[PDB]
Each structure stands twice: as C-alpha cells, then as structure tokens.
Design a binder for these strands. Sequence first.
RNA 1: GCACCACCAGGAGUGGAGCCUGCGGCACUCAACACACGCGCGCUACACUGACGGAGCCA
Lengths: 216, 217, 112, 93, 63, 184
Amino acid sequence: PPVLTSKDKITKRMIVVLAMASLETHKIKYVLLNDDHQGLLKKMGRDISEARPDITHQCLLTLLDSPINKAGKLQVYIQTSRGILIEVNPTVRIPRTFKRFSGLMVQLLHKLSIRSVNSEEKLLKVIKNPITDHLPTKCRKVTLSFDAPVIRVQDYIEKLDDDESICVFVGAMARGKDNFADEYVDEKVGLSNYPLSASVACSKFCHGAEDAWNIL
Amino acid sequence: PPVLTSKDKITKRMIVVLAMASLETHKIKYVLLNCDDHQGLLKKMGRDISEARPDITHQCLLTLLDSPINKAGKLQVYIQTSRGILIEVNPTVRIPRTFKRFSGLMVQLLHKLSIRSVNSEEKLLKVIKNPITDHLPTKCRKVTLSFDAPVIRVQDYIEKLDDDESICVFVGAMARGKDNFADEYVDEKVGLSNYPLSASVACSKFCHGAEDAWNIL
Amino acid sequence: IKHTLDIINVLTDQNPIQVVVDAITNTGPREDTTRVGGGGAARRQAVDVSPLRRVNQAIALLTIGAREAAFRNIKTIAETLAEELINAAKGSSTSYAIKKKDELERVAKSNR
Amino acid sequence: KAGERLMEALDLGIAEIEGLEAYNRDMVLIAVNKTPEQYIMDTLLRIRMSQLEDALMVMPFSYVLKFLKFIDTVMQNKTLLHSHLPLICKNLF
Amino acid sequence: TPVTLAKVIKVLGRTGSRGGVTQVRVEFLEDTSRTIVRNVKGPVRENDILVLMESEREARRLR
Amino acid sequence: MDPRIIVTTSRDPSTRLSQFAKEIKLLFPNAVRLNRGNYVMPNLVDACKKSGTTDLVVLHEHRGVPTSLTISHFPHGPTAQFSLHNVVMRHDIINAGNQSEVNPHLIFDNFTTALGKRVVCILKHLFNAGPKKDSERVITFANRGDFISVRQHVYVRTREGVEIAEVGPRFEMRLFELRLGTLE
RNA sequence: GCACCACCAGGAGUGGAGCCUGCGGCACUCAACACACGCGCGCUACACUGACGGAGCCA
C-alpha cells in the first residue's frame, strides 16, 4: 500500500483534523502543560482546558491504530489552540505511554520536525495556515457536533464521488462551542443523541468508513 | 433505560469481558504495577515486565463506556484479571480520564472490594465470584476475537442471532499473547480484520458494529 | 510554448490557438466570494467577478497547476501544459484548472 | 445607509398605506407623525444640498414605484408646510 | 442553467468592507430595459459585459 | 514655495537601509520614497528639472569614513554631504506620533554663524513642509563644533509641566564634503 | 481630504543549517482517585529547471 502525502490531491481518501488541540509547553527541560501541574495552572496563570493531552493522545491511539490507516486512506492534521498546524505521517509509531509522548511532543514543538529514524523522511511536520492549502482539490468538509443533526456515516460516505474526498473536523478539547471551523465547512454533522467524545466519534467515522468502503 | 445488572439473565444485550487484565498491587502507599514507573522494582520480583500494561484496559474502559450503546442501556462491561479477580462494571460509572487518577481508583478497588459513593449503595465497581457463566445470561453467545481465527462480518453475525440470544466477547487485555486465556467458556473464536488489532480498536469495532446492527443512535 | 503548439497540432489538430482560448473561457469562475468583515465573524458574500479578472485568473491557474504537476516527474513543462490546455478547453473536470472553477462557485451558491 | 434610509423609509410608509387602504370596504408606532408621509418628505430635507443625487441614483425602480405614491399623497394633501415645490421638482426631474 | 449576460452602463460609488465592491447599475441585453443593481468584485469600467449568475435578486451594502 | 523632496539609494538596500529610508520618508506632504533600477542615473537632472522639484537626498556608504547622507538643492546646485554616526539598526518607524505636515518649532543650539551658517539656512529651507507653522512637536539641531545631533520631541504638559517626549531616531552627523556651488 | 504598519489585488524578504559583521546585557468530558549568552544584516549550501563535452556570440 502506498503512503499518502500532501503533494498529491487526486486520490480519494479520509482526512481528519484534530482541531483546537491542547498543546502547551512549560519550563521548570520542557514538559507538556498538564497530573503533573494540574494544581499549578492558575498559580502560574494558566488554564484547565490547556491541561488535556490525553484527548489528543487517545485520538492518535484511536486513529493511528485503525484498520483503515493500515488500508492506507487516512491523513491526520492536528491544529492546536494557537494555530500550530501539524501533518502526521500515516507510518508513525505513537509511544504507548505518557512520558515518551510528552518528550516527543516537546522535541516536535521546538525542533519543528521529527525526521525518520531509518530513512530520509519527515515523520511529523509543522505547516502554514490555512488548512485549505493542504487538502485535496474536490473535498467535502464537515464538523462533528452534538448540537448538529444525527447522520449515519456509511450512507453519507456512500454519497461521495469517484474523486470527491472527505475531511472531517473534530474538537479535541474539554468543552465549549462547536464553532472552530465556521470558515471551513459545507456542513455541520452529528452522530448521536448523546454528548460524544472526540475519540469515539473519530472511531465511528473510521469504522463507518470501513463499512462504507468495504474495508475489513 | 434501567441499569443492567448480572441478575437479569433474560434481556438481549452486549457483554464485553476484558480478560487477563494487568491489575496487581504493591506496597512501597499502594500502587498499581506498571511497566513505566516500576520497571526495576518488577525486575526485583522476577516477573515479565512487559505485561504490566493497565493503559490498555483503561483505554478499553473509556472506549466501551463512552459509546452510546452504554448510554442506551444495551451494554455491560466486565473485568477479569490475569489473577482472575472478577469485577462487574456498573453501566453508569464514570472512569477517570488520566492514567494517574485511574491508577489510584484501581488501587482502592483492589484493596476495598467495592467502590461506591456515600450517597449510593449501588456499587459502581463490584468484586464478584467466578465463573462468569453464573453472571452471564442464559441465551448468550461466547466468542474470542483472534487473528488466528476465521474472519466474520459483524453486522451479519449479529443479524444471525436469535431474538433474545445475547453475546459476550472476550478481549485479552495484553500487549502480546495467545487467545487460550478463556477456552473453557467460549462457543467460537472469530476475527475482525486481516490486520493485527489492538484491544481498544477491536472493542470499538464490535461496539459501533453492534450499533450498526441494532441501529442504535 | 513553441513546443506546446506543436504537440497540440499533433494531438487533436484543432488549430492550437483554438485550444488556448477555450481554456481561457471555460476555466473562468462566473462568480466569487469576498471576505466581508461584518464584526468579528466574517461572512463570505457571493459577488459577481469582473471580466478583466476572469481573463487574469484563467492565466493564473493554468500556468501554476501545470508546473505543480510537472514538479518531480518524467514529463516537462510543455508536456504537462499541453495536458492542461486540452483538459480544460473541453470541460472534463480532470485538470487542475476546471476543479478550482467549480469549487469557488459551490461556495458562492452555498452562501448566497 | 442614506439610500437605505430612503428604502427603509419607503417600505415603512408604503407598508402603512397599504395597511390603511383595505380599511373596511374590504370587510408601527413611529416614523414620526400622524402620517408617515410627513416623515418621508422631511427626511428629504434632512439630507444635505450637495451630492444627494448619488443617493438617488443608487435606488432602483422599486424605489420609483414606492416613490411616486408619496408625491401623489402630498399633492392631494396640499402640504406645502413641510416640503416645497422647488424640492419636489428638483428631485423628480 | 440560467446564465445571464448583463452590461455596465453607469457606476455609482465604492462601498463594501474591503474596498472592491462597486455598486453598478446594469442592464441585461436579451429582454432589455429592466435594470438591476448588483455587487461586482474586480475593476469595472463603463460598457463592459458582466455575467449574472442569478437573475432576480439584489443587495446594496456590506459593512 | 514649499519644496518637493525625493529620496533615493543604491539598488541593494538591506533592512537597515529600508527602515532608515522609512524614517527619511517621514518628512512629508512632500517626501516620496523611490529606488532606482540602475545605481544612480545620470539623468536625474532631467528628472528634477522636468519634474520641477527642488531638493534631493541620497543615502550611500563608502570607506573613507563610514556611511553617508547627501543633500542637494537642485537648480542652483549647492550640495552638502554629511557623515552619520549609526546606521546599524534604527527603529522600525514609518509613521507614529503626528503627521509630518506638522511644522514643528526648530531649535539650533551652539550658535556658529561664521561658516556653518550656510548649513543653518538649508535646514530652515528643508523642514518648512506644511501650512501649519504652529508647534505640536519639535526638532533639535545641536552643534558641538563639527558634531551635530538630531532630536524629535513631543510637548507633554503635565500639571503645566513642560516635559519632552523622545520619539524617533537619534542622529549625530559631521560635515563631510560640501561642494562650492554656483549662482547658476 | 490624505497614507504600502487605510483595506481588497498580488509579488518579495527575514525568521530552519553554517560563516562572519556590528550591537545589546551579564477544580474537573475524571463520585471514588489524585489535585555563560542574545538580536539583526550580509555571505554559503540543500534545487533534479541534473551532470559532462564542445561550437556560436553581445556591453
């Protein structure tokens, strides 16, 4: 299976943007701003929703362990709360723990790239705004939301064309308004009558696409 | 939706058992033994350090319990350790999000046999007695997900159940190992993909495949 | 362009000044959106683009997207520019240029 | 805004005149006056003597159709007390 | 598809937020003498041919 | 009456010449920024005589002493070249405070009317931009013999207290070549 | 009225590696759980419009 890059715009695929990500560093050797300093936030003048790497961590363990990424139709773009924009290679290994995750995010955010451990490849990249610069040419854009009406994944992805790709916009934050992509979408979409997490919604779009695109 | 218990042996539901869970305590203060923070201390006991992976079971709890098939009242979650300590999950419990807080909750669960509020006597996490068949319903399907096993389709397999025949699924909560952990219970071993999956991906696979099956929104 | 008007004279003769002009016309967006401020939340507003701009954008998307496709492959500038003129003079929605015309109009229609 | 004062003004005044037209043979608090049309001419005196023609040439035919009815209204009402024939000829021409 | 061809006869002024929108009195050719005011985007001179997408709709001012 | 001033450098400015030319641009309603695509055209006499302008400012850099300012009144042709103190990195300012149409009061200190007086005329003849003639800011020309210093201050009264406001760059020039011009 | 720190149109820089020039300073999507150096300008590389060889020829 070929590896997908942003240089191609033609291949119909699945793109997820984990937007409004909680990625902040702190000096005390930099760590991610979180257990470790959950009680040192206002004491240092920082926020609580800024202390949530587990959401983005669990969404990367969600998306990058999916079968459809092993099928090779998935691209992950991660957008922080400041606008730091990240291309994630589909062949990257997430460290299964919190610590190597933390140090790898620090070396990512300050080296601006984490290159291949084996070859001449970029593993993680930081790119420029807007996000519309690096998505395929004819692509529907939607936003998952509790407050947007419920659709099924399978029939809706089966409305797509031969070249028409799909990118979805997922809020990887604690709470708040579902308006982080009002500039971007054609459509606000929903999946359940119950308030949904980011990771379980991403999983429903994954396996809904796998039942949609005959991926087993 | 009334809260599903082990006392209801009639209602057609989804039952998931996370078997061989890495749940082991230690006095230093009581901690849950993980590969990261207790590496050489598990080297002192003469153990397999790599199996100390509670993050997998935590990810399966947050994966299963946050799905709306829990919210609709068709799901029930059980924990079976590698030492076989059997814990019923109350379907309205709210598992900690972080590893450290869930670690302390697993500490107090393994030391106190019941985790409850001071308002409710309904046990949020309960220690019960082997075997699982005394707490499974009468009409229930028993499978082990294995890559060695033949691959089925999930919606077709649930559509080939009876009108009240339930289904219980065994997930080996481990990084590596064989599927022979609970062969004394099962009816069938099946698969889900041509790729080796993790535990939480299989759990969400049968969750949202079952929500595609029973049409739960 | 001296090579490209040989190639278009070879492939599907159609005297090659024909295939340029139709690629000028059939790539032009007949409407556009502007970023009106409005106060904080920028509405986009469907407006009708002036024909001096419809000439100029048609020059832009051809010459850029051909060099984008000619970036890192066996084919050259003139060969991929020959691809863009044929695939846009007949509306085929295969070229880079035709896809950008419809993507703007489906924004203006969705937000008029 | 100025031509929007004119179009909002005319939609208001025609919006009241059509409401009073089907009174009982077919069985808004404020612009300001007992009639809205005294509003309509006085706002014409409210705008300045220079470059109000730009405010006129903005306005389409719907402004004309809703426009002439106030002229026949004030010339049947014989109101010279709130506008004047040089203004009316100066605009209508 | 209703592709409508219109013609600039006289421009009015420069309105709109970002400063590109000219309110332009147009008169479309086929079935003439029925005027419309629209919002153009780029440079517009007199006696130019604009292409209307929708035929019966008008707005005037953008903040 | 009021002059028309043109500002020009070599074909290769860096940032440090760019922001400097942005400050020298801030002597308007008669100060205009302009590069040449050759280095210095020899047809600038037809440029100024055809345009009718009066004065020209050139920024360049040489190695007899470091960097150099050049001022010339065009029809007669006197030309003072002056040397600068600091061109390294000034403030990135293109307009702040008031506009340059505001004619300030002009201060000369350390009065030497022997042979620097031709300078003191030209600085009077340059900074009369605008119809204001009423002070809102102030520009200071400090003689220290052959060292001069340039200041820009704004009137900040406080409880009727005459407090200065330092704004803009701080220059210190020296008399470089001053070519003996003509009645022509 | 006026303006390239007034916006729409676009282009071009720095800001990544190296070299120096000058300058500066020394409560909760989680009841339970757990809470020495620097800055900026120029200068040099990485491009596959690739190499290598000739021949022509303009200030």
